[PDB]
Design a protein around this motif. Structure first.
Motif, PDB file in Angstrom:
ATOM      1  N   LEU A 107     -75.201  37.298 -94.692  1.00  0.00           N
ATOM      2  CA  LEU A 107     -75.385  38.579 -95.334  1.00  0.00           C
ATOM      3  C   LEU A 107     -74.424  39.598 -94.932  1.00  0.00           C
ATOM      4  N   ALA A 108     -74.371  39.667 -93.723  1.00  0.00           N
ATOM      5  CA  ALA A 108     -73.572  40.561 -92.935  1.00  0.00           C
ATOM      6  C   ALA A 108     -71.956  40.484 -93.211  1.00  0.00           C
ATOM      7  CB  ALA A 108     -73.903  40.820 -91.415  1.00  0.00           C
ATOM      8  N   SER A 109     -71.427  39.388 -92.966  1.00  0.00           N
ATOM      9  CA  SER A 109     -70.155  39.179 -93.508  1.00  0.00           C
ATOM     10  C   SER A 109     -69.825  39.111 -95.068  1.00  0.00           C
ATOM     11  CB  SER A 109     -69.661  37.718 -92.948  1.00  0.00           C
ATOM     12  N   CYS A 110     -70.989  38.877 -95.652  1.00  0.00           N
ATOM     13  CA  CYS A 110     -70.741  38.954 -97.229  1.00  0.00           C
ATOM     14  C   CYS A 110     -70.906  40.488 -97.734  1.00  0.00           C
ATOM     15  CB  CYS A 110     -71.800  38.156 -97.990  1.00  0.00           C
ATOM     16  N   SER A 111     -72.117  41.119 -97.346  1.00  0.00           N
ATOM     17  CA  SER A 111     -72.428  42.433 -97.696  1.00  0.00           C
ATOM     18  C   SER A 111     -72.309  43.472 -96.664  1.00  0.00           C
ATOM     19  CB  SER A 111     -73.677  42.410 -98.572  1.00  0.00           C
ATOM     20  N   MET A 112     -71.687  44.702 -97.083  1.00  0.00           N
ATOM     21  CA  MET A 112     -71.393  45.862 -96.248  1.00  0.00           C
ATOM     22  C   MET A 112     -72.903  46.311 -95.773  1.00  0.00           C
ATOM     23  N   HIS A 116     -60.905  33.380-100.840  1.00  0.00           N
ATOM     24  CA  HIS A 116     -61.957  34.344-100.299  1.00  0.00           C
ATOM     25  C   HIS A 116     -62.917  33.467 -99.484  1.00  0.00           C
ATOM     26  N   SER A 117     -63.072  32.164 -99.637  1.00  0.00           N
ATOM     27  CA  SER A 117     -63.941  31.457 -98.859  1.00  0.00           C
ATOM     28  C   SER A 117     -63.277  31.223 -97.349  1.00  0.00           C
ATOM     29  CB  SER A 117     -64.160  30.099 -99.512  1.00  0.00           C
ATOM     30  N   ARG A 118     -61.837  30.863 -97.513  1.00  0.00           N
ATOM     31  CA  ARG A 118     -61.160  30.818 -96.312  1.00  0.00           C
ATOM     32  C   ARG A 118     -61.061  31.963 -95.390  1.00  0.00           C
ATOM     33  N   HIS A 119     -60.979  33.086 -96.089  1.00  0.00           N
ATOM     34  CA  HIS A 119     -61.036  34.338 -95.390  1.00  0.00           C
ATOM     35  C   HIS A 119     -62.458  34.726 -94.910  1.00  0.00           C
ATOM     36  N   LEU A 120     -63.216  34.572 -95.730  1.00  0.00           N
ATOM     37  CA  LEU A 120     -64.728  34.539 -95.217  1.00  0.00           C
ATOM     38  C   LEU A 120     -64.939  33.843 -94.030  1.00  0.00           C
ATOM     39  N   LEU A 121     -64.356  32.326 -94.034  1.00  0.00           N
ATOM     40  CA  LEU A 121     -64.796  31.773 -92.838  1.00  0.00           C
ATOM     41  C   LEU A 121     -63.845  32.401 -91.640  1.00  0.00           C
ATOM     42  N   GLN A 122     -62.631  32.839 -91.739  1.00  0.00           N
ATOM     43  CA  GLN A 122     -61.856  33.774 -90.857  1.00  0.00           C
ATOM     44  C   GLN A 122     -62.569  34.967 -90.368  1.00  0.00           C
ATOM     45  N   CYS A 123     -63.452  35.786 -91.318  1.00  0.00           N
ATOM     46  CA  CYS A 123     -64.048  36.834 -90.952  1.00  0.00           C
ATOM     47  C   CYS A 123     -65.479  36.484 -90.191  1.00  0.00           C
ATOM     48  CB  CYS A 123     -64.454  37.680 -92.162  1.00  0.00           C
ATOM     49  N   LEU A 124     -65.891  35.352 -90.484  1.00  0.00           N
ATOM     50  CA  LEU A 124     -67.430  34.530 -89.743  1.00  0.00           C
ATOM     51  C   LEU A 124     -66.839  34.357 -88.313  1.00  0.00           C
ATOM     52  N   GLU A 137     -64.332  35.694 -86.750  1.00  0.00           N
ATOM     53  CA  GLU A 137     -64.246  36.739 -85.944  1.00  0.00           C
ATOM     54  C   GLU A 137     -65.346  37.384 -85.510  1.00  0.00           C
ATOM     55  N   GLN A 138     -66.468  37.383 -86.372  1.00  0.00           N
ATOM     56  CA  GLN A 138     -67.617  37.729 -85.976  1.00  0.00           C
ATOM     57  C   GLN A 138     -68.272  36.907 -84.645  1.00  0.00           C
ATOM     58  N   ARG A 139     -67.932  35.611 -84.728  1.00  0.00           N
ATOM     59  CA  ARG A 139     -68.354  34.656 -83.595  1.00  0.00           C
ATOM     60  C   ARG A 139     -67.727  34.978 -82.367  1.00  0.00           C
ATOM     61  N   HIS A 140     -66.308  35.489 -82.705  1.00  0.00           N
ATOM     62  CA  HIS A 140     -65.604  35.730 -81.286  1.00  0.00           C
ATOM     63  C   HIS A 140     -66.003  37.112 -80.782  1.00  0.00           C
ATOM     64  N   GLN A 141     -66.690  38.019 -81.707  1.00  0.00           N
ATOM     65  CA  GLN A 141     -67.348  39.212 -81.120  1.00  0.00           C
ATOM     66  C   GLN A 141     -68.627  38.966 -80.621  1.00  0.00           C
ATOM     67  N   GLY A 142     -69.495  38.146 -81.428  1.00  0.00           N
ATOM     68  CA  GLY A 142     -70.645  37.721 -80.893  1.00  0.00           C
ATOM     69  C   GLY A 142     -71.930  38.326 -81.714  1.00  0.00           C
ATOM     70  N   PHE A 143     -71.796  38.598 -82.925  1.00  0.00           N
ATOM     71  CA  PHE A 143     -72.737  39.320 -83.809  1.00  0.00           C
ATOM     72  C   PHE A 143     -73.632  38.186 -84.307  1.00  0.00           C
TER      73      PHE A 143
END
Lengths: 120, 119
Positions: free
Chosen positions: A40-45, B4-12, B14-20
């Motif tokens: 939800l965080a990656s999806c929604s701000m 958008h799915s591939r970019h969301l995978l990339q963003c996730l 990045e979040q896993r590289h950061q640790g959230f």
């Protein structure tokens, strides 16, 4: 490689529909949707802000927003795990309202403008 | 939408590289890797079985395997978010061994065998 990304997205969508590893359980109205908080965080701000506030070890056990249509919330959660130009028969009013309350992708409101171009 | 799915995978990623939102913290050797538990579960069936066993007792993954090269584990997580036949100049032996221990996608070991057969 990219088909692998789409397949990992589909597998994560199945894990969110079943409930495996649901770091958060967001329930606005009587209905209750549960899934990973980071999703939800990656999806929604708005969920990202909830995660920023939850960094201080808070519990993402739940969350409620008033006048945010729960059917629209479920459709938005699905659209996070699905495609574009998905009208799906819901009222554009509540759609834009939920998109803003969740701070969702602006393109939704752009489609709202398309709905305004559909009656004249 | 799919881009958008591939970019969301990339963003996730990045979040896993950061640790959230790291429901698990897997550390095999001296190094310690932290990321989302659901990511490793969706990636590896061995992680899925570990998650099924860990569902009754919410714990940090702290999973360790002997003679499983930790650089291979880091390369495996990154390529799990990348794909595209990455070799990274590391010895294929430890790579195939870790991939087999993790029950990773068979294509990994298949490409390792193809590279071993090209020589």
């Amino acid at each position: 490689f990219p088909d692998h990304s789409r397949h990992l997205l589909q597998c994560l969508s199945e894990q969110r529909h079943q409930g495996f590893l649901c770091d958060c359980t967001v329930l606005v109205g009587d209905a209750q949707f549960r899934a990973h908080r980071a999703v939800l965080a990656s999806c929604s701000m708005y969920f990202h802000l909830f995660y920023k506030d939850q960094l201080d070890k808070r519990d993402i056990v739940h969350l409620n927003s008033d006048i945010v249509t729960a059917p629209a919330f479920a459709l938005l959660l699905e659209f996070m795990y699905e495609g574009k130009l998905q009208f799906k028969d819901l009222p554009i009013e509540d759609v834009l309202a939920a998109a803003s309350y969740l701070h969702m992708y602006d393109i939704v409101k752009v489609c709202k403008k398309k709905l305004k171009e559909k009656a004249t």
